[PDB]
Amino acid sequence: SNSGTEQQNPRGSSLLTDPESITKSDPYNPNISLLISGEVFTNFRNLIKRVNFRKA
Amino acid sequence: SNSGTEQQNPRGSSLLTDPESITKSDPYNPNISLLISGEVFTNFRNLIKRVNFRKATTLNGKRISDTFDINSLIEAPRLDIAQYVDTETKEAKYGFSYFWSAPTTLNIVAEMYALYRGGVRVKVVTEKGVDFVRATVSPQQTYGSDVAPTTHISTPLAIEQIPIKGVAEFQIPYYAPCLSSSFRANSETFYYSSGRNNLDIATSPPSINRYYAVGAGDDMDFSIFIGTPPCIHASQTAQFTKIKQGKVYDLRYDQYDPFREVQDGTAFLNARSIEDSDLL
Amino acid sequence: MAEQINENYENKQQLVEQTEITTFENDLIVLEDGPQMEESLPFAFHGQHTDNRQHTVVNFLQRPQVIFDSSWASDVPRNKQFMDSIMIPDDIISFPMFAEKLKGFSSLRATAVITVQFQTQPFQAGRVMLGSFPLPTLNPTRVKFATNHVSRLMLLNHVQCDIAKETEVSLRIPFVSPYNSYDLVSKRFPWAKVVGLVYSPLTTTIPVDFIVYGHFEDVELGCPTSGMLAQ
Amino acid sequence: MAEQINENYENKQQLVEQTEITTFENDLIVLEDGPQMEESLPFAFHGQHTDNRQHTVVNFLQRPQVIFDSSWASDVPRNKQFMDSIMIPDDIISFPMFAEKLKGFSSLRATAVITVQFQTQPFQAGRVMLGSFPLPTLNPTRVKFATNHVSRLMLLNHVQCDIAKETEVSLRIPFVSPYNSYDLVSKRFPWAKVVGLVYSPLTTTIPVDFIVYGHFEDVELGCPTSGMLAQ
Amino acid sequence: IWQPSHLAYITSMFKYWTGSLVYTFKFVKTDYHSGRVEVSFHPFSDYTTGTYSDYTYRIIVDLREKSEFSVTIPFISPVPYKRISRPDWDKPYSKYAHASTGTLVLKALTSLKATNTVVSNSVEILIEVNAGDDFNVIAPIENIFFPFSLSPG
């Protein structure tokens, strides 16, 4: 459940699975970044392509 | 029939069906817009793509930047009341004025609607000798801080080179928390419905005059019909009353468009924007 | 998953009992008792206190609620108000029948229905217009110019009434906002301002009386909340 | 039936539209308009303001509500109260979560559930009793004699807790009355008085803390009412 | 210089965020302490006077043997996205209404029970923050934090 004696949210577990919702139901809303932003951001590998000024 | 006891043409019925013809026959002629005009007009969503000039930045110095709000461009500019004083006889004459501004094709459509959604297109014309023009958007408010930064390190940058492309065209996306945003002024302060964005146009070397032309981006969409805006007659642009030091045009306007003549109207003395409370 | 080898503590997954909203998760022991072998009396024996129907919180919102009950004489002319303006839904959900129910809910997304009655003996004339300006707090620049004159209200979403023909009139205002819903805890972003103008004045001395009803349909209530803000 | 031959007045059976509670029956004409061809946005576009669930007025009554949150030391002995007495349901439905919902209802017939938590580190001892005297306003002669002593409360409907064993305790009190329901507009005839005695005193200095929850199940709400009485 | 959260830094270059968050509570204690806490999520409001937590999704956890606690707090807001900002602990929700969904509260239901001759009277609450699974972040036109590198000494 949400509480107990074992570590309820270690690192290795946070990377994969979320704890139970406070509602004890589905807590997730659907991704609508493409529907409002008009674009989707998922990985910093793409974002670094953006060129900004660095030195002079 | 054409008459009766029930409402013969309410709004909800006018949107869908027309009343019977006076001829009691088919009253409709076929669409031949494509056959005479050579083109077809059906939706204002396409017409707003047309870009016309909107504002001009003259009254600053030789700067290397010009920051201003983006949603203010979807509004039609404020109409101002101009006080003119006769340098000789010292009596006042009164007219109207657009202070370094003018509406766009876009502004004719946007003033019929309540909310907007989509990107705005801004194209700049500069003076001679300018080599570059750069565009960047920034949030205008670092939320929770009394001050906003003067630089940014992850913002968009877009460089156009004037002497090889004379008009610097930029497209500013829709960045706001909500589905469809608001573009008019309000006193709401609890949380916000507008996406408040700045837009910084730079020139290398620094210059004084910046002429801006605005238009609708592809994804432009307005939401709720509200009604026709307050308008001014276009013929009022050429009507003038003569006084000693020159002409006083009923609708006074500046060289907002770097390709229009400068009208021969004398400068005013005071300007006052028509408030909503001034209407009688 | 970080793997965990536990043998001294039971994964007490029972002793975890959600009751509608509140989740208890307990250690030691959970106990429960009462009179055993519970029965209920048949419905003839009681049920003289109830109707043969159930009322949720969605109705109580679909109920019409009187907002106005007044009149207007022949002294008011065209383009002037015959009724006070109504903020949707602020001037509706502030009545106790609705407010007591909306409490404990975050927000509200629904279409509102403004109905107005009209009293006429067949010797009276006149027409009257009932319109709605969307989102008046977001475009305050444009409110009073779209509502000070007939023919700028009627091209908006409006409903007319011929005094000598219509005895009831109801305008359906769907929810519309830059947002998903209407914040109830802060009452932020009303989605229309109902205004009532005079399309044509009265032709006799006898005033006309009217009743303004308001309810909601297409009701989507938000998340449960305490609903209290600092001041 | 007295037979009636009418030919000058239409049996206008339409223009009769009940909306949940209110019935309009109209003459002349009923009109209704708005923006036509109404659609709705799909649920991804909004619905960030709601949970994937609906709440009626029956829940909001099935929700546990905190009544008490206190302690009791080792100075209180057997046969003395460790918690204040609770009138069922007066001391429950007077909290705003319930009272705001029960409003607009005539009466309530339901079984009430009193749950009590107990905090113990494993070094503490003692036992505590939680009983309920039925209909205390109808037999006031007998209340304080059936609740001043353990062994006159525990033969009533009661629930005990060994401080070092039970961390939660819940007594189910079914509705019981000479009547069908519990008058809400006048708050007449509470069906139990929950009292809390000490079966055995504490053996250490460290007091024990407790939380008292209360909710209802088997809920039959009455007829809708205004619910206001003269004074 | 106050330094940014992991989430603060990662969302520092964007402008708006959304999605559920995961708040973890550690209680450094033994099996011989005891206590009830109440974790109630008030989605649109503050926690002030007249704020009953019985209206809200809450979890009453009995901390006798149990020691940790972790919940996914959903995204409930009138806006599909809320604002990234300079963080402020000591602000209510009614201010920062544009950057937060609501307030979460960890509230004692009870004193801490403990015999003083073997265990302590204090137990430290340790709060962690994780960012759910639907956590989406848009509009990359802001900067709240400038990073720098250090010089070798």
PDB file of N, CA, C and O in Angstrom, chain B residues 137-199:
ATOM      1  N   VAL B 137      11.744  35.405 -27.778  1.00  0.00           N
ATOM      2  CA  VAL B 137      10.613  35.563 -26.874  1.00  0.00           C
ATOM      3  C   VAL B 137      11.074  35.252 -25.457  1.00  0.00           C
ATOM      4  O   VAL B 137      11.971  34.434 -25.230  1.00  0.00           O
ATOM      5  N   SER B 138      10.457  35.932 -24.495  1.00  0.00           N
ATOM      6  CA  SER B 138      10.762  35.737 -23.089  1.00  0.00           C
ATOM      7  C   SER B 138       9.498  35.989 -22.285  1.00  0.00           C
ATOM      8  O   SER B 138       8.618  36.724 -22.739  1.00  0.00           O
ATOM      9  N   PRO B 139       9.378  35.405 -21.089  1.00  0.00           N
ATOM     10  CA  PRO B 139       8.083  35.353 -20.407  1.00  0.00           C
ATOM     11  C   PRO B 139       7.575  36.647 -19.778  1.00  0.00           C
ATOM     12  O   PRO B 139       6.507  36.614 -19.166  1.00  0.00           O
ATOM     13  N   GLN B 140       8.300  37.767 -19.867  1.00  0.00           N
ATOM     14  CA  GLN B 140       7.861  39.043 -19.295  1.00  0.00           C
ATOM     15  C   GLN B 140       7.809  39.043 -17.765  1.00  0.00           C
ATOM     16  O   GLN B 140       7.976  40.089 -17.134  1.00  0.00           O
ATOM     17  N   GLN B 141       7.586  37.892 -17.150  1.00  0.00           N
ATOM     18  CA  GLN B 141       7.476  37.817 -15.698  1.00  0.00           C
ATOM     19  C   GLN B 141       8.128  36.528 -15.234  1.00  0.00           C
ATOM     20  O   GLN B 141       7.624  35.442 -15.528  1.00  0.00           O
ATOM     21  N   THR B 142       9.237  36.639 -14.516  1.00  0.00           N
ATOM     22  CA  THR B 142       9.687  35.509 -13.721  1.00  0.00           C
ATOM     23  C   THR B 142       8.781  35.432 -12.506  1.00  0.00           C
ATOM     24  O   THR B 142       8.923  36.205 -11.556  1.00  0.00           O
ATOM     25  N   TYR B 143       7.825  34.510 -12.560  1.00  0.00           N
ATOM     26  CA  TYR B 143       6.759  34.444 -11.575  1.00  0.00           C
ATOM     27  C   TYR B 143       7.337  34.345 -10.177  1.00  0.00           C
ATOM     28  O   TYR B 143       8.215  33.525  -9.914  1.00  0.00           O
ATOM     29  N   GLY B 144       6.866  35.205  -9.289  1.00  0.00           N
ATOM     30  CA  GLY B 144       7.346  35.198  -7.929  1.00  0.00           C
ATOM     31  C   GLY B 144       8.561  36.053  -7.671  1.00  0.00           C
ATOM     32  O   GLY B 144       8.984  36.157  -6.514  1.00  0.00           O
ATOM     33  N   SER B 145       9.135  36.666  -8.702  1.00  0.00           N
ATOM     34  CA  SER B 145      10.253  37.588  -8.562  1.00  0.00           C
ATOM     35  C   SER B 145       9.816  38.997  -8.939  1.00  0.00           C
ATOM     36  O   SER B 145       9.080  39.188  -9.909  1.00  0.00           O
ATOM     37  N   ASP B 146      10.286  39.987  -8.179  1.00  0.00           N
ATOM     38  CA  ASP B 146       9.946  41.367  -8.499  1.00  0.00           C
ATOM     39  C   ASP B 146      10.581  41.837  -9.801  1.00  0.00           C
ATOM     40  O   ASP B 146      10.136  42.841 -10.365  1.00  0.00           O
ATOM     41  N   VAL B 147      11.599  41.136 -10.294  1.00  0.00           N
ATOM     42  CA  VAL B 147      12.294  41.524 -11.513  1.00  0.00           C
ATOM     43  C   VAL B 147      12.504  40.297 -12.388  1.00  0.00           C
ATOM     44  O   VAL B 147      12.616  39.170 -11.898  1.00  0.00           O
ATOM     45  N   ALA B 148      12.558  40.523 -13.672  1.00  0.00           N
ATOM     46  CA  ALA B 148      12.828  39.573 -14.733  1.00  0.00           C
ATOM     47  C   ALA B 148      14.267  39.705 -15.214  1.00  0.00           C
ATOM     48  O   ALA B 148      14.835  40.797 -15.180  1.00  0.00           O
ATOM     49  N   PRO B 149      14.893  38.624 -15.680  1.00  0.00           N
ATOM     50  CA  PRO B 149      16.277  38.723 -16.152  1.00  0.00           C
ATOM     51  C   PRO B 149      16.387  39.642 -17.353  1.00  0.00           C
ATOM     52  O   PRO B 149      15.405  39.932 -18.034  1.00  0.00           O
ATOM     53  N   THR B 150      17.606  40.100 -17.618  1.00  0.00           N
ATOM     54  CA  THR B 150      17.867  40.849 -18.835  1.00  0.00           C
ATOM     55  C   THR B 150      18.441  39.987 -19.953  1.00  0.00           C
ATOM     56  O   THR B 150      18.462  40.433 -21.105  1.00  0.00           O
ATOM     57  N   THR B 151      18.903  38.777 -19.647  1.00  0.00           N
ATOM     58  CA  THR B 151      19.304  37.806 -20.657  1.00  0.00           C
ATOM     59  C   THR B 151      18.569  36.496 -20.432  1.00  0.00           C
ATOM     60  O   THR B 151      17.850  36.311 -19.444  1.00  0.00           O
ATOM     61  N   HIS B 152      18.769  35.581 -21.378  1.00  0.00           N
ATOM     62  CA  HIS B 152      18.310  34.208 -21.281  1.00  0.00           C
ATOM     63  C   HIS B 152      19.314  33.335 -22.022  1.00  0.00           C
ATOM     64  O   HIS B 152      20.058  33.807 -22.886  1.00  0.00           O
ATOM     65  N   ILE B 153      19.361  32.059 -21.657  1.00  0.00           N
ATOM     66  CA  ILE B 153      20.343  31.140 -22.221  1.00  0.00           C
ATOM     67  C   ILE B 153      19.715  29.965 -22.947  1.00  0.00           C
ATOM     68  O   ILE B 153      20.442  29.210 -23.610  1.00  0.00           O
ATOM     69  N   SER B 154      18.401  29.778 -22.863  1.00  0.00           N
ATOM     70  CA  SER B 154      17.747  28.679 -23.561  1.00  0.00           C
ATOM     71  C   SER B 154      16.559  29.150 -24.385  1.00  0.00           C
ATOM     72  O   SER B 154      15.718  28.337 -24.759  1.00  0.00           O
ATOM     73  N   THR B 155      16.459  30.444 -24.651  1.00  0.00           N
ATOM     74  CA  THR B 155      15.341  30.997 -25.396  1.00  0.00           C
ATOM     75  C   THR B 155      15.559  30.829 -26.891  1.00  0.00           C
ATOM     76  O   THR B 155      16.659  30.521 -27.348  1.00  0.00           O
ATOM     77  N   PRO B 156      14.513  31.014 -27.688  1.00  0.00           N
ATOM     78  CA  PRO B 156      14.671  30.900 -29.140  1.00  0.00           C
ATOM     79  C   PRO B 156      15.409  32.094 -29.706  1.00  0.00           C
ATOM     80  O   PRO B 156      15.206  33.227 -29.273  1.00  0.00           O
ATOM     81  N   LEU B 157      16.274  31.836 -30.680  1.00  0.00           N
ATOM     82  CA  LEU B 157      16.957  32.892 -31.416  1.00  0.00           C
ATOM     83  C   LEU B 157      16.740  32.687 -32.910  1.00  0.00           C
ATOM     84  O   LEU B 157      16.782  31.552 -33.391  1.00  0.00           O
ATOM     85  N   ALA B 158      16.517  33.781 -33.643  1.00  0.00           N
ATOM     86  CA  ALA B 158      16.252  33.693 -35.077  1.00  0.00           C
ATOM     87  C   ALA B 158      16.832  34.912 -35.768  1.00  0.00           C
ATOM     88  O   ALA B 158      16.360  36.025 -35.532  1.00  0.00           O
ATOM     89  N   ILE B 159      17.810  34.703 -36.647  1.00  0.00           N
ATOM     90  CA  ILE B 159      18.582  35.785 -37.253  1.00  0.00           C
ATOM     91  C   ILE B 159      18.247  35.876 -38.738  1.00  0.00           C
ATOM     92  O   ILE B 159      18.356  34.884 -39.469  1.00  0.00           O
ATOM     93  N   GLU B 160      17.867  37.073 -39.187  1.00  0.00           N
ATOM     94  CA  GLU B 160      17.657  37.388 -40.595  1.00  0.00           C
ATOM     95  C   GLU B 160      18.641  38.463 -41.027  1.00  0.00           C
ATOM     96  O   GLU B 160      18.925  39.396 -40.271  1.00  0.00           O
ATOM     97  N   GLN B 161      19.148  38.351 -42.247  1.00  0.00           N
ATOM     98  CA  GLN B 161      20.176  39.260 -42.750  1.00  0.00           C
ATOM     99  C   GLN B 161      19.558  40.201 -43.778  1.00  0.00           C
ATOM    100  O   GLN B 161      19.232  39.789 -44.897  1.00  0.00           O
ATOM    101  N   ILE B 162      19.423  41.468 -43.406  1.00  0.00           N
ATOM    102  CA  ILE B 162      18.668  42.450 -44.180  1.00  0.00           C
ATOM    103  C   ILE B 162      19.218  42.624 -45.593  1.00  0.00           C
ATOM    104  O   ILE B 162      18.461  42.427 -46.553  1.00  0.00           O
ATOM    105  N   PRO B 163      20.496  42.974 -45.797  1.00  0.00           N
ATOM    106  CA  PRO B 163      20.942  43.320 -47.159  1.00  0.00           C
ATOM    107  C   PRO B 163      20.850  42.167 -48.145  1.00  0.00           C
ATOM    108  O   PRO B 163      21.103  42.374 -49.337  1.00  0.00           O
ATOM    109  N   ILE B 164      20.484  40.973 -47.689  1.00  0.00           N
ATOM    110  CA  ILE B 164      20.179  39.859 -48.579  1.00  0.00           C
ATOM    111  C   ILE B 164      18.741  39.383 -48.441  1.00  0.00           C
ATOM    112  O   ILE B 164      18.259  38.651 -49.320  1.00  0.00           O
ATOM    113  N   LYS B 165      18.046  39.762 -47.369  1.00  0.00           N
ATOM    114  CA  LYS B 165      16.601  39.559 -47.279  1.00  0.00           C
ATOM    115  C   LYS B 165      16.058  40.760 -46.523  1.00  0.00           C
ATOM    116  O   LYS B 165      16.246  40.854 -45.312  1.00  0.00           O
ATOM    117  N   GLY B 166      15.399  41.677 -47.233  1.00  0.00           N
ATOM    118  CA  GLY B 166      15.095  42.984 -46.672  1.00  0.00           C
ATOM    119  C   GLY B 166      14.015  43.002 -45.613  1.00  0.00           C
ATOM    120  O   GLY B 166      13.963  43.946 -44.816  1.00  0.00           O
ATOM    121  N   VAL B 167      13.149  41.998 -45.588  1.00  0.00           N
ATOM    122  CA  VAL B 167      12.087  41.900 -44.591  1.00  0.00           C
ATOM    123  C   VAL B 167      12.417  40.737 -43.665  1.00  0.00           C
ATOM    124  O   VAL B 167      12.567  39.597 -44.117  1.00  0.00           O
ATOM    125  N   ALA B 168      12.526  41.020 -42.374  1.00  0.00           N
ATOM    126  CA  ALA B 168      12.888  40.007 -41.387  1.00  0.00           C
ATOM    127  C   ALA B 168      11.612  39.364 -40.878  1.00  0.00           C
ATOM    128  O   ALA B 168      10.894  39.941 -40.068  1.00  0.00           O
ATOM    129  N   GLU B 169      11.322  38.161 -41.349  1.00  0.00           N
ATOM    130  CA  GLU B 169      10.085  37.465 -41.018  1.00  0.00           C
ATOM    131  C   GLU B 169      10.315  36.508 -39.857  1.00  0.00           C
ATOM    132  O   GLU B 169      11.230  35.685 -39.895  1.00  0.00           O
ATOM    133  N   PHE B 170       9.476  36.603 -38.837  1.00  0.00           N
ATOM    134  CA  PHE B 170       9.537  35.704 -37.697  1.00  0.00           C
ATOM    135  C   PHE B 170       8.149  35.149 -37.416  1.00  0.00           C
ATOM    136  O   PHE B 170       7.142  35.760 -37.778  1.00  0.00           O
ATOM    137  N   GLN B 171       8.098  33.982 -36.774  1.00  0.00           N
ATOM    138  CA  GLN B 171       6.835  33.389 -36.346  1.00  0.00           C
ATOM    139  C   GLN B 171       6.937  33.057 -34.869  1.00  0.00           C
ATOM    140  O   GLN B 171       7.818  32.294 -34.465  1.00  0.00           O
ATOM    141  N   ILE B 172       6.042  33.621 -34.066  1.00  0.00           N
ATOM    142  CA  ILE B 172       6.066  33.445 -32.617  1.00  0.00           C
ATOM    143  C   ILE B 172       4.998  32.430 -32.232  1.00  0.00           C
ATOM    144  O   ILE B 172       3.804  32.698 -32.440  1.00  0.00           O
ATOM    145  N   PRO B 173       5.363  31.305 -31.645  1.00  0.00           N
ATOM    146  CA  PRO B 173       4.373  30.260 -31.369  1.00  0.00           C
ATOM    147  C   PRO B 173       3.365  30.654 -30.303  1.00  0.00           C
ATOM    148  O   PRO B 173       3.397  31.769 -29.777  1.00  0.00           O
ATOM    149  N   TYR B 174       2.464  29.720 -29.999  1.00  0.00           N
ATOM    150  CA  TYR B 174       1.474  29.872 -28.938  1.00  0.00           C
ATOM    151  C   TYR B 174       2.028  29.168 -27.706  1.00  0.00           C
ATOM    152  O   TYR B 174       2.116  27.935 -27.676  1.00  0.00           O
ATOM    153  N   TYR B 175       2.432  29.949 -26.714  1.00  0.00           N
ATOM    154  CA  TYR B 175       2.956  29.436 -25.449  1.00  0.00           C
ATOM    155  C   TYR B 175       2.133  30.050 -24.323  1.00  0.00           C
ATOM    156  O   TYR B 175       2.371  31.192 -23.918  1.00  0.00           O
ATOM    157  N   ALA B 176       1.168  29.288 -23.822  1.00  0.00           N
ATOM    158  CA  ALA B 176       0.263  29.715 -22.770  1.00  0.00           C
ATOM    159  C   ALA B 176      -0.228  28.472 -22.049  1.00  0.00           C
ATOM    160  O   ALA B 176      -0.276  27.394 -22.649  1.00  0.00           O
ATOM    161  N   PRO B 177      -0.598  28.582 -20.774  1.00  0.00           N
ATOM    162  CA  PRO B 177      -0.987  27.378 -20.030  1.00  0.00           C
ATOM    163  C   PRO B 177      -2.314  26.793 -20.463  1.00  0.00           C
ATOM    164  O   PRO B 177      -2.541  25.599 -20.245  1.00  0.00           O
ATOM    165  N   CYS B 178      -3.189  27.586 -21.067  1.00  0.00           N
ATOM    166  CA  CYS B 178      -4.574  27.206 -21.298  1.00  0.00           C
ATOM    167  C   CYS B 178      -4.813  26.811 -22.744  1.00  0.00           C
ATOM    168  O   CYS B 178      -4.014  27.082 -23.633  1.00  0.00           O
ATOM    169  N   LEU B 179      -5.957  26.177 -22.975  1.00  0.00           N
ATOM    170  CA  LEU B 179      -6.324  25.731 -24.310  1.00  0.00           C
ATOM    171  C   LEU B 179      -6.291  26.911 -25.268  1.00  0.00           C
ATOM    172  O   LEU B 179      -5.448  26.954 -26.165  1.00  0.00           O
ATOM    173  N   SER B 180      -7.193  27.869 -25.067  1.00  0.00           N
ATOM    174  CA  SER B 180      -7.251  29.101 -25.847  1.00  0.00           C
ATOM    175  C   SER B 180      -7.048  30.286 -24.911  1.00  0.00           C
ATOM    176  O   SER B 180      -7.622  30.332 -23.822  1.00  0.00           O
ATOM    177  N   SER B 181      -6.228  31.242 -25.329  1.00  0.00           N
ATOM    178  CA  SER B 181      -5.816  32.325 -24.451  1.00  0.00           C
ATOM    179  C   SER B 181      -6.624  33.589 -24.716  1.00  0.00           C
ATOM    180  O   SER B 181      -7.431  33.658 -25.645  1.00  0.00           O
ATOM    181  N   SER B 182      -6.392  34.595 -23.876  1.00  0.00           N
ATOM    182  CA  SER B 182      -7.004  35.907 -24.008  1.00  0.00           C
ATOM    183  C   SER B 182      -5.954  36.928 -24.428  1.00  0.00           C
ATOM    184  O   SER B 182      -4.779  36.817 -24.062  1.00  0.00           O
ATOM    185  N   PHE B 183      -6.381  37.936 -25.189  1.00  0.00           N
ATOM    186  CA  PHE B 183      -5.457  38.911 -25.749  1.00  0.00           C
ATOM    187  C   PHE B 183      -5.794  40.358 -25.427  1.00  0.00           C
ATOM    188  O   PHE B 183      -5.056  41.252 -25.858  1.00  0.00           O
ATOM    189  N   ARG B 184      -6.872  40.621 -24.701  1.00  0.00           N
ATOM    190  CA  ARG B 184      -7.248  41.972 -24.311  1.00  0.00           C
ATOM    191  C   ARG B 184      -6.883  42.230 -22.855  1.00  0.00           C
ATOM    192  O   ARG B 184      -6.630  41.309 -22.077  1.00  0.00           O
ATOM    193  N   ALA B 185      -6.858  43.509 -22.497  1.00  0.00           N
ATOM    194  CA  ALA B 185      -6.459  43.886 -21.153  1.00  0.00           C
ATOM    195  C   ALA B 185      -7.561  43.565 -20.160  1.00  0.00           C
ATOM    196  O   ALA B 185      -8.750  43.704 -20.461  1.00  0.00           O
ATOM    197  N   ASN B 186      -7.158  43.127 -18.971  1.00  0.00           N
ATOM    198  CA  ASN B 186      -8.092  42.882 -17.884  1.00  0.00           C
ATOM    199  C   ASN B 186      -7.383  43.177 -16.576  1.00  0.00           C
ATOM    200  O   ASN B 186      -6.166  43.366 -16.538  1.00  0.00           O
ATOM    201  N   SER B 187      -8.153  43.190 -15.494  1.00  0.00           N
ATOM    202  CA  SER B 187      -7.595  43.396 -14.169  1.00  0.00           C
ATOM    203  C   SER B 187      -7.453  42.097 -13.393  1.00  0.00           C
ATOM    204  O   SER B 187      -7.233  42.127 -12.180  1.00  0.00           O
ATOM    205  N   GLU B 188      -7.566  40.960 -14.065  1.00  0.00           N
ATOM    206  CA  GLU B 188      -7.414  39.684 -13.387  1.00  0.00           C
ATOM    207  C   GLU B 188      -5.973  39.501 -12.930  1.00  0.00           C
ATOM    208  O   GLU B 188      -5.037  39.718 -13.700  1.00  0.00           O
ATOM    209  N   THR B 189      -5.795  39.115 -11.669  1.00  0.00           N
ATOM    210  CA  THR B 189      -4.469  38.991 -11.083  1.00  0.00           C
ATOM    211  C   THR B 189      -4.269  37.735 -10.255  1.00  0.00           C
ATOM    212  O   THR B 189      -3.142  37.496  -9.811  1.00  0.00           O
ATOM    213  N   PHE B 190      -5.315  36.942 -10.012  1.00  0.00           N
ATOM    214  CA  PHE B 190      -5.195  35.780  -9.133  1.00  0.00           C
ATOM    215  C   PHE B 190      -4.326  34.704  -9.773  1.00  0.00           C
ATOM    216  O   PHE B 190      -3.287  34.319  -9.228  1.00  0.00           O
ATOM    217  N   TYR B 191      -4.750  34.191 -10.923  1.00  0.00           N
ATOM    218  CA  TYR B 191      -3.879  33.512 -11.871  1.00  0.00           C
ATOM    219  C   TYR B 191      -4.325  33.939 -13.256  1.00  0.00           C
ATOM    220  O   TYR B 191      -5.377  34.561 -13.427  1.00  0.00           O
ATOM    221  N   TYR B 192      -3.508  33.646 -14.254  1.00  0.00           N
ATOM    222  CA  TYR B 192      -3.633  34.337 -15.525  1.00  0.00           C
ATOM    223  C   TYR B 192      -4.128  33.427 -16.638  1.00  0.00           C
ATOM    224  O   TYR B 192      -3.857  32.226 -16.661  1.00  0.00           O
ATOM    225  N   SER B 193      -4.887  34.036 -17.553  1.00  0.00           N
ATOM    226  CA  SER B 193      -5.418  33.374 -18.733  1.00  0.00           C
ATOM    227  C   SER B 193      -4.663  33.719 -20.000  1.00  0.00           C
ATOM    228  O   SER B 193      -4.773  32.987 -20.984  1.00  0.00           O
ATOM    229  N   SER B 194      -3.924  34.813 -20.011  1.00  0.00           N
ATOM    230  CA  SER B 194      -3.090  35.150 -21.148  1.00  0.00           C
ATOM    231  C   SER B 194      -1.721  34.506 -20.987  1.00  0.00           C
ATOM    232  O   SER B 194      -1.234  34.302 -19.874  1.00  0.00           O
ATOM    233  N   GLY B 195      -1.115  34.159 -22.111  1.00  0.00           N
ATOM    234  CA  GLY B 195       0.287  33.810 -22.101  1.00  0.00           C
ATOM    235  C   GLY B 195       1.103  35.065 -22.311  1.00  0.00           C
ATOM    236  O   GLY B 195       1.232  35.540 -23.441  1.00  0.00           O
ATOM    237  N   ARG B 196       1.644  35.630 -21.234  1.00  0.00           N
ATOM    238  CA  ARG B 196       2.325  36.920 -21.306  1.00  0.00           C
ATOM    239  C   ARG B 196       3.743  36.740 -21.828  1.00  0.00           C
ATOM    240  O   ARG B 196       4.612  36.232 -21.113  1.00  0.00           O
ATOM    241  N   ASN B 197       3.996  37.200 -23.051  1.00  0.00           N
ATOM    242  CA  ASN B 197       5.291  37.019 -23.692  1.00  0.00           C
ATOM    243  C   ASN B 197       5.836  38.341 -24.213  1.00  0.00           C
ATOM    244  O   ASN B 197       5.090  39.180 -24.725  1.00  0.00           O
ATOM    245  N   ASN B 198       7.141  38.516 -24.078  1.00  0.00           N
ATOM    246  CA  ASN B 198       7.843  39.605 -24.733  1.00  0.00           C
ATOM    247  C   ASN B 198       8.421  39.124 -26.055  1.00  0.00           C
ATOM    248  O   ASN B 198       8.503  37.930 -26.328  1.00  0.00           O
ATOM    249  N   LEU B 199       8.842  40.075 -26.876  1.00  0.00           N
ATOM    250  CA  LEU B 199       9.487  39.773 -28.145  1.00  0.00           C
ATOM    251  C   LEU B 199      10.522  40.855 -28.398  1.00  0.00           C
ATOM    252  O   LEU B 199      10.176  42.036 -28.459  1.00  0.00           O
TER     253      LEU B 199
END
